[PDB]
Amino acid sequence: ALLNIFDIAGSALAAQSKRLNVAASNLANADSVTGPDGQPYRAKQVVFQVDAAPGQATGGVKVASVIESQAPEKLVYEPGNPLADANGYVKMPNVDVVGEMVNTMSASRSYQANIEVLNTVKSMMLKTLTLGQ
Amino acid sequence: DRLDAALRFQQEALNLRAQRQEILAANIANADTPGYQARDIDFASELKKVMVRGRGVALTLTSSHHIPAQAVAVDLLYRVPDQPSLDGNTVDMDRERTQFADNSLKYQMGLTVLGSQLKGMMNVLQG
């Protein structure tokens, strides 16, 4: 009832941390050209799902997967680069800078809301042990 | 003795919670140590083993000048990592903080229940 809330809020904190890490990775490599192989950096996005191990519909949030966006890769005309294709274009990532900064701030705020929830319920569960004594 | 048997469960659970608190504190203290895999124990299975087996063979002290057995044990399971870190550090601090808070709360619960049992016995004995 109230002990499950620790699992729910911890799952929420983990999911928001994963989303924040993905946003930081997107910001870090907005100007990146190539990876360890010859392929460009495809922007990452986490997938949030509802985690209800029992049958009661609702529960915490879980990160099912990390996917690479299928948005069109930006093309820059650089024919002297060995990475360029037949037309001399190089694939640069499609990172949405404003979107990723907004994701960072929103993930931070949700993280704090879950922190506050955990603090409050921890206090309530500490106080319930006092019952009649 | 029956006084031990009636009080055994909560005492063993409290001891296991103290040991797991030590393990979680070691995980938190190692939050920046490279190449450190976060460790933990499964509380339910370990407590079931503690109750079923017993907390091994004590040698026979033939004479008072014989020496008794001296000293010599939980299964430390690795925590699955959430996200990869380049320094090989597995300790995820959000899960560790959540489990530390939950373990502390359950330790308080065990203290309260064991105290309730002991105080019930004492109030029974009070004439």
Partner: peptide, 20 residues
Amino acid sequence: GVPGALSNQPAPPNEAPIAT
């Protein structure tokens, strides 16, 4: 298994190579 579950075997070491 689950990202935050308990397993009996250490996670494989993670390395970040510059090029493959």
